[PDB]
């Protein structure tokens, strides 16, 4: 039926439904706009009025307006046709391709698979980059979540990745920009279509882009998300596939949910928070999975709030996390790219278990003399190593010999370094660290390890030095 | 040798605390920023405290 | 049918004020239409403001919201025991129902000082340090505290593993059911959990009430209460349930988030006060009783995650205060691989010996002193780098007993073996040796000492204490062993 | 299988004076050692399934 | 498997006209079929693609240490 | 009156007495109780309404459900039949030994005794820990804060003193164990009964147990503390006796004022603390005294908050006390126990009269000492620690074996040290220190020092040592 | 409409650390909670919101383009300051000037490691 715009203050959209008065999350189309201008009930407040959430943007609203629900949650295309595609929030194209000929829509809630449902057998999502593997160590199906810094190249990381993943994946992908730059979407764009993975003659790419870019209107932004595990879901337990799931950024959605808490009319929780962070995370985060019915891999970009992981949002995030990927400013200053910190970038997965010991210990090792180098830092930091004794010294050079090892070169963003692109394998990541722990080398200058590929490039590198 | 030594010493306390001097600027920032950050936290935890008081 | 029901008189946030139902009973659980279960915890004059435990997509306004007429139980029995259940006590492990048909009252408050009788039991988990260091008794409650998944969990796991030849006892002063709450972790993790004890079966003896990241916030919150009636319950009968609750921290958020929806404010650190009573009560109720109890227990494990270590960190705080001993993880000693990763200068028994087996007295004592100076030893003269002979035994000897503590991930173990190897160090035999040998070695002697020296073990489990002889027995055979380890 | 027994002796071990060995016994008792605990870990036996009644729950 | 009588008479009645039947019991439906071939795939490799009705079989060596 | 409940929000429960009101505070008893609830006044909200406290839980409560008030605040069984007696707040046999045969009832609003009632002097009361006494030097009826931070046999500690006063004097005891776990309370109950100083077959000891644990509605907590204290003063002047009062812990009294303040609608002011924390107190405290007609030797163990003091509620805390103790958690990770924090732990009572100079000047000095010991902190963390320039070593050390003299067992916690506790009645010690200021015992080296009693068997140890 | 018109117009804003600030202060008296910096978060959908809407369009909108040179003005640099990582994160690249060098006369100053183009990957003359 037909609701009145009693209130409109922003997109909480205040809408006396008297006539009908459906449940909460019956989509409403606004009767008297053009526009599929969607809320989506939140609340029923009573007296038949229900706040609703505009997903979209409002104006030119004379209020009591008719608004007529749709009387669904967002209902929307489904189908592999979507693959290559670029679908709004709505699920409409965006990539304007004309429409889509979905199969069905749906719901954009979608739940939680089911405990018993769960097959959950960890098995290293491999990289090549020795840093990932070794240090962040991401499993097929895992969910792994990237905090990262502003532009470090945290999203050339995802990218980078994507490239080296996705490509060889069997699986499909998916890629929501939510709440992403639209010009990194058309950056995005441009490469996917010329990397042809996004081959347009293909709405059977390997990749499906939805995108609810920065721009949206927040409850666009907030909601986007549930529809893309939506999709995922489709896929995977509809199509088998083993998604890879881009999310630029989960911190959006995040960020949209406090932002709306407020005229949620809410007690948002500290710093003004969605208290609802919490629910809201968790309802998404039992939609993500790697059921049975194969895996949402699931590469969820976390901006880090104020790079605050203490806050309560990566906080709580952590325990959804299963590889937590920290891109690490102070490395980033350190000039890194790679920029993480593995100490801090850690994986559940990362285990003498799931990625065998040898990782781990000569991780262990790594993340020891790391460690203790982390502690020194700081003495030195005044005292410079310097009456600090050096097999301090050496080890600690070695520990960032290690560290200049893992810096590797990016192949997508030559262009941004330089620095041609490494990729490398196991093994001679293995044998990388053991031969550095070996201080066999070690005798060597400690740039010789920078942005190198294989310990051999180091080797080529260090003739090159000396 | 103790010549040498001295002057290293005495070198040594001037770096040092020049190295000092930087770092304690660089947490004086920390300081009143997180400074404020409590009272901010604070007044928050006031303002909505006397905005939903008993 | 009338008025204890009542219509919704407005729903958003699973927030039911709801008018009507008002002569009813003080946080009783109702009843929705939906068949969701709810909590009337605010009687306003106007309106009922009941807790929805599912969630409101599901409902709507004016909804007959029905009184169940009962103020919670939950399932009781022990058919919980192979169980991962919900904390309405129902199978979420999907394996049909349980068989805990009974219910019992979670808001059944404590006991009382004299239905009680203190500690004077050891519990043991099998991690030597834990045994050892902060030995820890049965009744009790001790807090694990620490950051994400140092094998986070894998400290319960593993102790409860170990509890499974204790359950392969036939004891009950060791037989130990165990109950696992898991707050906030979700289904995967948990899965992987359920897994992991199913490995280990040691799922038979235990109860896994799990709410995971999914449920609605009260239905985490719940979950430990129940965990707690459902542990009580043993308590009163004899047995000795150990409940780990994993953790009220997740917990609190909810809950302040649950006051925050009942427009309550929150308190410090923004969370509300009596989440201190709740979890002050809540934590109350475990306790070892007195024999006319059966003298049972239930020993409490919590689990609090620091963020940043930070135990200010209001609720930790409180926590703490609780506690009666906590168990600090440190993560650096984790890195440099050292699991132990404990600051047993942070990690506190503060009982110490009615915890106790007299067998781990006799090395413990000393080497906790010795290990005192040891890690003293590392701050007067030496914040990093120097020599001398005397103590650079200590030192030596010192990271030995790092390595025999040391306990990697997943290890469940019993006392006297754990004491054998102790004993080797303490008593000065390896010293010598590197550290990389010693687990190697520990292994090598343990086999040896399983098979041949199972005698001997026999009799220092018997004895629950080494007895001199058994010492001696130990002397030649740990040196030998040694020299076997050559010779 | 079932397999019996000699205990460690390492004045054994040094003296072989064929010398084409000398090494080989340090070692050689060292994958002993790899067997020992094996064996010393698991049991002989699994159990065996009643057919009968899984018969009753299996419909082929 | 019962209940109110008052529903239940025609209820069950349904239910076991279905057992009395024998293209299906009373009728199968392909959505079922489908997803029993599905989860048939799947649980393989919950336990492996070996079959058991079969049993396993080992081999057997030895080196000589001095 | 009679009341309905007209709102349980929470286990506030606001009633609305019908037949008009009962004064503030008073205490209500709600009417289809099967454990009386007990309802304490807190706003006649108006509307015959009141906001009342729950003083039992709320469960299973009809609402509307009548009340009948007491008609009084809050009244308690009083009467020498406490002695050797576990109440609770409401006085009841939570000895679980049968009703206690209380000959006096009294409201717990007991208030603050007024200016001319107090005595103005006391004497220092010596509790022969060498430490204690030296640089808080107690008064007898003082207000002696134990601040200490959890866990740290403070506790235990505490029981101690409670052994070696409570039983040296014919000074009576309450002790409130409030807030405290249920099981502690337990264990510390088996200690008296053990004691004997629970001594049962005469029911009396002395001593009254009041408990308030941790479970318990907050507000009832916070009052348990009145009830003690209204018992007490009862004992105090009217037994006569000096009643040693033991309150674990009044910081949790203050947190319990706290997590209700919100819902008392008072702001609970900064750090959460309620914005009343000052009358709270002041009125507590005030309401405590060691009058002329007898003492009230009040030992309030606080738990600092966080170790902090600077925490707004501590630091009012201060203002009431005479005597701090304050417990450092640092010195306790020195691992000592004495773990005390001593350059705080003080009576602003120290004099050159009253504890004479010669306590007073020792403590001054070695106070000193320790003060300016800690300046030489200051080189040695980085520059050295057996090595930097020598005189200052001679301080060090002495400073050093102070602190190993300062240290003296525990005695009863002797059962996980295996250490006898000691105690070194007042000159010995004094002289004791004099001894070592006088760097007798330079020849003689540390560890000897450690955790004794008095010198000798320091010099005594050191004979032991010497193998 | 510039973009939408072909040309490339610059808009230099100049700066919206004022802006969000102002803004803030709207939400707060329009008593509208904050977190951050005692800012709401929408002030990140403002600039956003804002920033979006600079952009090259391809050729139907005459190739035309709105260039942005937002200035943010630090307030001793704090990128740490978070409405500074929101722009920055939306951004394509920052120019951070050091003040020191500058101080020291040096016209310019800028923080050169900082001052980055990261979108700016290929977008100048061949020549330089």
Redesign the interface.
Known sequence: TTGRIVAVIGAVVDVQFDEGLPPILNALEVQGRETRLVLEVAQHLGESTVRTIAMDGTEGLVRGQKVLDSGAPIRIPVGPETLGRIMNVIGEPIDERGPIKTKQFAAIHAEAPEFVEMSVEQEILVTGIKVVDLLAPYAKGGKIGLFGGAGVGKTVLIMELINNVAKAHGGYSVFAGVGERTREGNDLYHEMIESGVINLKDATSKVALVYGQMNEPPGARARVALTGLTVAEYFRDQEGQDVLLFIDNIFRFTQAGSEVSALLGRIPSAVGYQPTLATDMGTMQERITTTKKGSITSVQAIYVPADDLTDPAPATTFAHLDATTVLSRAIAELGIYPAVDPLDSTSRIMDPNIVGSEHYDVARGVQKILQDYKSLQDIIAILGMDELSEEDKLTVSRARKIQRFLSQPFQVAEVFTGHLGKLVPLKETIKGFQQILAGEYDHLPEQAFYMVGPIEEAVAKADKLA | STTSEQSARMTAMDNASKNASEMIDKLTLTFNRTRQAVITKELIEIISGAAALD | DLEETGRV?????GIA?VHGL???????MVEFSSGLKGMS?????DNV?VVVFGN??????GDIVKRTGA?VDVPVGEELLGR?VDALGNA???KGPIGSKARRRV?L??????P???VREPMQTGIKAVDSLVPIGRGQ?ELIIGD??TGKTSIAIDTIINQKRFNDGTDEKKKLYCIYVAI?????????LV?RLTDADAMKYTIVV?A??????PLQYLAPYSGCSMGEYFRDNGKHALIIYDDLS?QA??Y??MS??L????????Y???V??LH??LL??A??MNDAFGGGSLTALPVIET??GD??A?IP?NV??????QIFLE??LF???IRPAINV?LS?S?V??AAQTRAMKQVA?TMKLEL?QYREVAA??????DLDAATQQLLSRGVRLTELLKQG?YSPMAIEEQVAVIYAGVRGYLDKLEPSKITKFE??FL?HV??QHQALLGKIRTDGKISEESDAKLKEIVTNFL??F?? | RKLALKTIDWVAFGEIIPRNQKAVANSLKSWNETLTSRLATLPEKPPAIDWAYYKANVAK | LDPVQKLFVDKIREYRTKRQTSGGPVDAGPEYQQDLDRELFKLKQMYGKADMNTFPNFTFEDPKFE
């Open positions: 008189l407005s729903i958003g946030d004020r008002r002569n009813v009973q003080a946080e009783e915890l605010n009687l306003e004059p403001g409101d997509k599901l409902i709507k306004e103020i991962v979420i492990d999907g808001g408050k404590a006991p009382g000082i004299i009680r009788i203190s409650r994400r998944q906030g972790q979700k289904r995967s993790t948990v899965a992987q897994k799990s995971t990241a999914s449920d609605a916030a997740k958020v909810a302040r988030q925050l929806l427009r309550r404010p929150p308190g410090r650190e923004a509300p006060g009596d201190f009573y002050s009560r109350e109720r306790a070892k963020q940043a135990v200010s209001y705080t703490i205060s609780i506690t009666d001993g993560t650096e890195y440099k691989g200068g506190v503060r110490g010996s004592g005192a007067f003269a030496q914040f990093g780098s991930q292994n090598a086999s399983i098979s020299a076997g050559e010779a």
